[PDB]
Amino acid sequence: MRTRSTISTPNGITWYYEQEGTGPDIVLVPDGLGECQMFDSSVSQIAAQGFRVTTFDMPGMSRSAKAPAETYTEVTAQKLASYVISILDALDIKHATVWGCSSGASTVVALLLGYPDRIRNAMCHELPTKLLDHLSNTAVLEDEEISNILANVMLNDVSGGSEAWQALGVEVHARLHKNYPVFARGYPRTIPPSAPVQDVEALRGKPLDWTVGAATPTESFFDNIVTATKAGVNIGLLPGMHFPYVSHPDVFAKYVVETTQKHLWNSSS
Amino acid sequence: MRTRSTISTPNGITWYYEQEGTGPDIVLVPDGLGECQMFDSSVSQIAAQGFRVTTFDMPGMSRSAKAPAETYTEVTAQKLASYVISILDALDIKHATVWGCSSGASTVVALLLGYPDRIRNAMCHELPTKLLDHLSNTAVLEDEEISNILANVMLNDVSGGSEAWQALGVEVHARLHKNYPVFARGYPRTIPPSAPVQDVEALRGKPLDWTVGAATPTESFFDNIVTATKAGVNIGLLPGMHFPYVSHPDVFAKYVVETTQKHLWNSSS
Ligand SMILES: C[C@H]1CCCC(=O)CCC/C=C/c2cc(O)cc(O)c2C(=O)O1
Ligand SMILES: C[C@H]1CCCC(=O)CCC/C=C/c2cc(O)cc(O)c2C(=O)O1
Ligand SMILES: [K+]
Ligand SMILES: [K+]
């Protein structure tokens, strides 16, 4: 029942995308590694509740590698939001619920603020707002060293579930191996300063649901909790750390379905 | 230069206390384990900046164990605050800066709200507001089983630094071993409901500085970050987890000195 295909947008990107289901649109935006096979189990569980679920590899990453250099260098939340609107236009998705973690969280908040007509509600997880010099400094290393460093960081530090991370399988980890240097060179120096959470008053009253990983060290996304609270935005926890859709796919799917259902009820009111 | 002595209060407690320095008073209230040797390094560093620093073992714990059963059973923040005021009265400390972690955090917020004339400013760290059934249920075990389990929890789950925790040494750990059953049967069921942070407007504008451990899992004190932000209370991080005075004594001492200095400036202004 899963469609697995490609589509070309006039910004030069040939996207790899997947779709499953019929009903209101839910769109799952990857984190900065840009790999949508991380959503495989959750896509089926969400679509089974009466939704059309779309996800895709991000430009320059995995199976969406046929893209111009400006789509995967000096990457900002605003650039990524423009690229997601281009694929939603191409797939004739006029109204969508959106999920994103990390650079995907920055993307979905930029989509909600920038394209309010198009976005029913946004779920953002672990949105990066601070530069991390130790991450930024990987960008000048050789490709094989970047891949070794970041593969180990994902497995041992931020997966929230090493057994689930390994169980993504050989083909996914071979794609991620090639993405690590693209991500290192294009994301960490430019994504955090582009975070669309400068203006707390712009967030107030918006259909935004924000999460942090329960096991994530407090310091990592402390600022997300403060910002959401100041803006009166719903803020809570998912199990695990930076990849709840990998570590806890059934909890993740249930969260996405229940949050979408809450906004469908409120919108009809 | 350090006083190490005992003093009896009319509520029946014989306190073990320490004192060092001259200048404005800073009082360091222990966490639920009630062991003031955890402050030893920091007492000297804070006192050397021009302050009189006082600390003590808590009633029923360590060298303050000669105390009525009411002082270490069905313990609440408001009971602990009344006991701390009794020792400050006995030592002729009229106006104090106070620090506390855990049940000590609940105590110092109860002190600031209940005795505003006596408290210059309060620093609270990791204030427990939720019941933890796994902890409350230790109370029905045998004393040696409680001590074995909670010694392991302290080292591996909340110390924030296994080397510094073990380096407290045999004398300290032997006193903690006797305290674990007293803590387990007195604190976990009654401390969290007594948390004096249910009235958010009562906190607004108060001379309160709140911290959580940087390495603490986000879920542990997520509610502290939300509550402080809603009240407009200064909220930030210290390195480590539940015992920054053990894991990072020099950073802890600097934080206590700087925060006290900020309130001395603001008091004069
Ligand atoms: C790729 C994924 C795993 C990156 C995981 C990682 O490096 C741990 C720190 C959490 C920050 C992630 C991150 C930071 C940025 O500055 C820019 C980003 O796009 C991300 C991000 O997308 O997270
Ligand atoms: C020292 C540590 C002991 C117990 C430390 C522990 O097991 C987890 C620390 C988080 C909560 C601690 C705590 C919880 C309560 O319900 C009541 C308390 O008095 C505390 C408390 O004092 O913390
Ligand atoms: K699950
Ligand atoms: K230190």
Side-chain angles (χ1 to χ4, degrees):
Chain A
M1 295 294 103
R2 185 77 55 87
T3 298
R4 300 182 169 91
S5 198
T6 65
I7 198 158
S8 293
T9 51
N11 51 25
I13 306 165
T14 293
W15 299 87
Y16 174 79
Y17 76 96
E18 303 190 351
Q19 286 193 315
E20 187 165 336
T22 57
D25 283 295
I26 294 174
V27 174
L28 310 176
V29 180
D31 57 83
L33 302 183
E35 169 57 63
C36 79
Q37 177 57 15
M38 292 188 190
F39 297 117
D40 182 26
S41 171
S42 298
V43 165
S44 292
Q45 300 181 60
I46 296 163
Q49 299 300 318
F51 295 104
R52 182 165 63 175
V53 184
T54 302
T55 191
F56 31 80
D57 295 342
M58 289 296 276
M61 309 296 180
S62 293
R63 298 154 294 184
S64 290
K66 294 183 184 61
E70 57 268 21
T71 69
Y72 57 81
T73 60
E74 303 186 311
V75 181
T76 65
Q78 296 75 32
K79 279 165 86 171
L80 292 180
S82 75
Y83 307 154
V84 173
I85 285 293
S86 77
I87 194 179
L88 300 187
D89 285 351
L91 290 170
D92 194 33
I93 295 167
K94 299 176 197 76
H95 301 298
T97 293
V98 293
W99 157 281
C101 174
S102 211
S103 55
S106 310
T107 301
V108 299
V109 179
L111 281 172
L112 178 59
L113 292 182
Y115 315 78
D117 48 302
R118 304 294 300 273
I119 304 303
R120 177 184 301 107
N121 64 289
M123 285 162 280
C124 58
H125 185 82
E126 296 196 348
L127 199 158
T129 63
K130 300 174 142 68
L131 292 170
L132 298 176
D133 288 346
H134 289 158
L135 177 61
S136 297
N137 289 340
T138 68
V140 300
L141 298 168
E142 306 289 7
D143 285 5
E144 292 306 297
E145 190 171 2
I146 296 172
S147 302
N148 285 339
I149 289 169
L150 292 186
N152 180 62
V153 168
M154 299 311 148
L155 169 64
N156 289 312
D157 296 341
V158 300
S159 68
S162 59
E163 291 186 354
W165 184 262
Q166 289 179 299
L168 287 171
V170 163
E171 174 168 42
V172 167
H173 287 297
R175 292 200 295 266
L176 292 180
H177 179 83
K178 291 161 67 178
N179 298 349
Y180 291 126
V182 180
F183 165 82
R185 292 192 293 259
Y187 281 59
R189 297 168 296 172
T190 45
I191 280 288
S194 80
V197 297
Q198 278 177 208
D199 180 5
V200 166
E201 290 310 317
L203 302 177
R204 194 176 311 283
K206 296 295 195 290
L208 185 62
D209 291 88
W210 201 322
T211 51
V212 171
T216 297
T218 295
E219 64 177 339
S220 300
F221 295 98
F222 174 89
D223 67 275
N224 285 197
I225 303 169
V226 168
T227 298
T229 303
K230 285 182 166 178
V233 166
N234 294 339
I235 176 87
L237 300 175
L238 289 170
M241 295 192 179
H242 205 54
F243 300 88
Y245 35 95
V246 177
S247 61
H248 299 79
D250 300 11
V251 176
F252 170 77
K254 193 173 172 182
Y255 174 71
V256 169
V257 167
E258 285 186 336
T259 300
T260 305
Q261 287 169 338
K262 165 178 85 184
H263 284 282
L264 287 166
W265 176 262
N266 294 339
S267 74
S268 285
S269 290
Chain B
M1 284 316 95
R2 174 96 45 103
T3 297
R4 304 182 164 91
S5 194
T6 63
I7 192 166
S8 295
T9 48
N11 50 21
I13 302 158
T14 299
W15 300 84
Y16 174 83
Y17 78 99
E18 304 192 346
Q19 193 177 69
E20 182 168 342
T22 55
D25 283 289
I26 297 176
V27 176
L28 310 175
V29 179
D31 55 81
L33 307 180
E35 169 57 64
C36 76
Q37 175 58 20
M38 292 188 188
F39 295 118
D40 179 18
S41 172
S42 298
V43 166
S44 291
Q45 299 179 59
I46 297 165
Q49 300 298 315
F51 297 98
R52 184 165 65 179
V53 184
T54 305
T55 190
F56 34 78
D57 293 346
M58 294 293 275
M61 303 304 180
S62 296
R63 298 153 291 190
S64 291
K66 182 182 176 172
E70 182 175 355
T71 72
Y72 55 81
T73 53
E74 298 182 330
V75 180
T76 65
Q78 294 77 25
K79 288 170 70 169
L80 290 181
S82 70
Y83 307 148
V84 172
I85 288 292
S86 78
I87 191 183
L88 301 188
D89 286 351
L91 294 173
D92 195 30
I93 295 169
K94 292 183 201 213
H95 204 226
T97 294
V98 293
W99 157 276
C101 171
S102 212
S103 53
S106 304
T107 301
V108 297
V109 176
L111 281 167
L112 176 56
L113 297 179
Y115 310 83
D117 55 302
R118 301 295 295 277
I119 309 303
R120 178 185 297 110
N121 62 293
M123 283 157 283
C124 59
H125 186 81
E126 291 197 347
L127 195 157
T129 65
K130 299 168 168 173
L131 292 168
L132 297 172
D133 292 338
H134 286 341
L135 180 63
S136 303
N137 292 335
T138 60
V140 303
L141 300 172
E142 298 303 303
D143 286 2
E144 189 48 48
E145 316 181 71
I146 298 172
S147 301
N148 181 291
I149 289 163
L150 292 189
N152 182 257
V153 166
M154 295 310 135
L155 169 59
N156 290 119
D157 294 342
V158 295
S159 69
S162 62
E163 185 181 356
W165 185 253
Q166 288 309 109
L168 289 171
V170 53
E171 190 179 300
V172 169
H173 284 296
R175 289 199 296 267
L176 295 174
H177 196 89
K178 295 162 75 172
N179 297 350
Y180 289 128
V182 181
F183 167 77
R185 291 193 202 107
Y187 280 62
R189 288 197 181 278
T190 50
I191 282 286
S194 76
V197 295
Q198 108 191 358
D199 184 355
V200 159
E201 288 311 315
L203 301 176
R204 191 179 309 281
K206 297 296 196 290
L208 187 61
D209 291 85
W210 202 325
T211 49
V212 173
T216 294
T218 295
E219 65 183 344
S220 298
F221 296 95
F222 174 90
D223 68 278
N224 285 201
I225 302 163
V226 168
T227 296
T229 302
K230 289 180 168 184
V233 168
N234 179 54
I235 176 81
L237 300 175
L238 291 171
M241 298 192 177
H242 207 53
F243 299 92
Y245 37 96
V246 179
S247 59
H248 300 83
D250 301 6
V251 178
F252 171 77
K254 187 179 186 180
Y255 171 72
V256 170
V257 165
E258 290 186 335
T259 300
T260 305
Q261 292 169 331
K262 168 178 68 174
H263 286 281
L264 287 161
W265 174 266
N266 293 1
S267 295
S268 288
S269 69

